[PDB]
Amino acid sequence: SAVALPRVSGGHDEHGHLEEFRTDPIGLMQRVRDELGDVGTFQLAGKQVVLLSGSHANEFFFRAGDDDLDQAKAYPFMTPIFGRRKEMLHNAALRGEQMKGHAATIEDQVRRMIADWGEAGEIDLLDFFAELTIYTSSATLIGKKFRDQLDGRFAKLYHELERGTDPLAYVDPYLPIESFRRRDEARNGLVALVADIMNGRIANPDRDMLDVLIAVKAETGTPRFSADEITGMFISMMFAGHHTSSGTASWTLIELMRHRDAYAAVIDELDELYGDGRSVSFHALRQIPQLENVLKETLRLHPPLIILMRVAKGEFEVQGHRIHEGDLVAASPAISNRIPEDFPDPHDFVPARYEQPRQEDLLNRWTWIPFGAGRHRCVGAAFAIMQIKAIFSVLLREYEFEMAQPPESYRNDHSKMVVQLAQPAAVRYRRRT
Ligand code: HEM
Numbered sequence: 001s002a003v004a005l006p007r008v009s010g011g012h013d014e015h016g017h018l019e020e021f022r023t024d025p026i027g028l029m030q031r032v033r034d035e036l037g038d039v040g041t042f043q044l045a046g047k048q049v050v051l052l053s054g055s056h057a058n059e060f061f062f063r064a065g066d067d068d069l070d071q072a073k074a075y076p077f078m079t080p081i082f083g084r085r086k087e088m089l090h091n092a093a094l095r096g097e098q099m100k101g102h103a104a105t106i107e108d109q110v111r112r113m114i115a116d117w118g119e120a121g122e123i124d125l126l127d128f129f130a131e132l133t134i135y136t137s138s139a140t141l142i143g144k145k146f147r148d149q150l151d152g153r154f155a156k157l158y159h160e161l162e163r164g165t166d167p168l169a170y171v172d173p174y175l176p177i178e179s180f181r182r183r184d185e186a187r188n189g190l191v192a193l194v195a196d197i198m199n200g201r202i203a204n205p206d207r208d209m210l211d212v213l214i215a216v217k218a219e220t221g222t223p224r225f226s227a228d229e230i231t232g233m234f235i236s237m238m239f240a241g242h243h244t245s246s247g248t249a250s251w252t253l254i255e256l257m258r259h260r261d262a263y264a265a266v267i268d269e270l271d272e273l274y275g276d277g278r279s280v281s282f283h284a285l286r287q288i289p290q291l292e293n294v295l296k297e298t299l300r301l302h303p304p305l306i307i308l309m310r311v312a313k314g315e316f317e318v319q320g321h322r323i324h325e326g327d328l329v330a331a332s333p334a335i336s337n338r339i340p341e342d343f344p345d346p347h348d349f350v351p352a353r354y355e356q357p358r359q360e361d362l363l364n365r366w367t368w369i370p371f372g373a374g375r376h377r378c379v380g381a382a383f384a385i386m387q388i389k390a391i392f393s394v395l396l397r398e399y400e401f402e403m404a405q406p407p408e409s410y411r412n413d414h415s416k417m418v419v420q421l422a423q424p425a426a427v428r429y430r431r432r433t
Contacts, residue, residue, distance in 0.1 A: 005050065005321050006036040011131045016043025018276045022167045025157045025414050027308060028431065029335045039321040045171045045371045050317065053335055060318050062374030067313055069329055071376060074309035077417050079170030080183065081161050083232040092143045094383055102140045104281040106390040109135045111327060114398065117429060122404055125250040125425035127218040129153040133246040136387065143208025149197050160186030160223060162243055165417040189236065193228035241380050243418050244304040245387055250421045251302040252295055254410050257403050270397055284390035293351035295388050296361055299370035303333035304419055308372060336367045347398055399429040
């Protein structure tokens with residue numbers, strides 16, 4: 001007896017539109033908007049997703065209180081990965097007064113990663129940036145000491161965790177599928193790496209977070225936290241900022257290479273700015289215009305999170321369409337960031353959009369959403385931007401990059417809820433001079 005909301009075409013497979021969502025989620029979300037407008041739905045297994053788009057619908061979505069649109073249970077694929085607390089996990093390291101030190105830490109991690117590059121060579125962006133950001137994340141959020149005890153193994157296993165986010169999780173996150181199996185196995189591997197580090201510290205003692213948790217005794221003198229508990233906490237702290245920063249660093253370089261005029265502009269800028277003799281820790285926290293605009297455009301075109309989920313906790317009305325409790329409600333940066341009315345020539349790379357005269361990011365407060373908006377806006381935004389500035393201030397002044405494959409061959413893999421750059425993503429480098 002209730003009015004059914006508009007539903008997008010297709011979705012006749014076993015789990016509705018889920019199968020298409022696993023193969024081409026952006027095409028699906030775009031068809032929802034093309035056929036229905038600002039409010040439309042698609043079937044995700046046994047759930048109905050009310051996909052909102054456009055300034056009006058997005059405003060409702062982002063300004064909604066935690067009591068109206070709940071985020072907590074919107075991402076089922078995360079529970080098996082982790083194994084209020086949101087503030088704790090990040091807040092601490094994101095304090096402005098700590099940014100300078102983090103920038104210096106990031107610079108050091110980058111230099112360490114490129115220490116063996118030599119005069120010239122070739123890298124794969126996913127392998128490089130995924131590993132690099134594991135080191136930047138662990139160093140800044142857990143401690144340099146802890147990072148120094150990590151190698152490529154931790155990175156490989158963390159990546160397996162991320163790949164264990166198939167949309168099938170919306171059916172059941174524990175289904176006996178290979179990606180879920182590899183996910184659980186990788187988490188056990190991570191717990192083992194942590195246990196090994198804990199043991200090593202026992203035998204032979206700049207203290208970090210692990211030293212703190214390790215010293216915490218219960219009452220009988222027995223350690224309070226197990227390797228599993230600690231690893232779960234560490235995984236939690238590093239997740240929000242890993243795939244996002246990794247992917248964004250990859251696309252920033254790709255777009256720079258695809259657009260040599262912007263690349264040249266950034267180079268000139270970097271050389272001039274650093275001509276003042278100040279460190280990356282100083283400049284990564286201050287204006288670097290051209291690079292910043294290249295980053296903003298890269299994020300508009302390649303938002304690491306293409307869909308944002310919520311669970312309706314009540315009935316609401318958006319444009320005459322009624323949302324019911326239990327309804328999954330979503331917004332899409334992938335789609336919204338390319339609305340033609342809001343962003344002239346939305347498929348074109350135009351950093352100038354963000355220059356003082358245009359400022360399309362600030363003008364479209366509800367549709368330029370790579371970092372989300374409203375109360376749930378990305379709390380790591382300032383940090384992520386600082387990181388890009390620090391990373392490229394190093395890379396672009398030390399090396400020159402060129403695509404080793406067709407410009408159009410670089411693409412993302414959208415088969416999992418966590419988007420990852422697809423491979424190969426081969427790039428050649430050569431020392432600058
Ligand atoms: C340029 C890279 C990044 C992008 C594009 C990005 C994007 C986003 C987006 C779109 C959201 C909203 C999710 C939602 O509404 O469900 C978000 C949330 C969040 N991000 Fe990021 N993020 C980035 C880097 C980071 C980093 C490095 C950290 C770690 C400090 C971080 C921590 C968080 C947290 C804790 C939330 C949840 C905020 C809340 O519930 O209010 N992000 N991010």
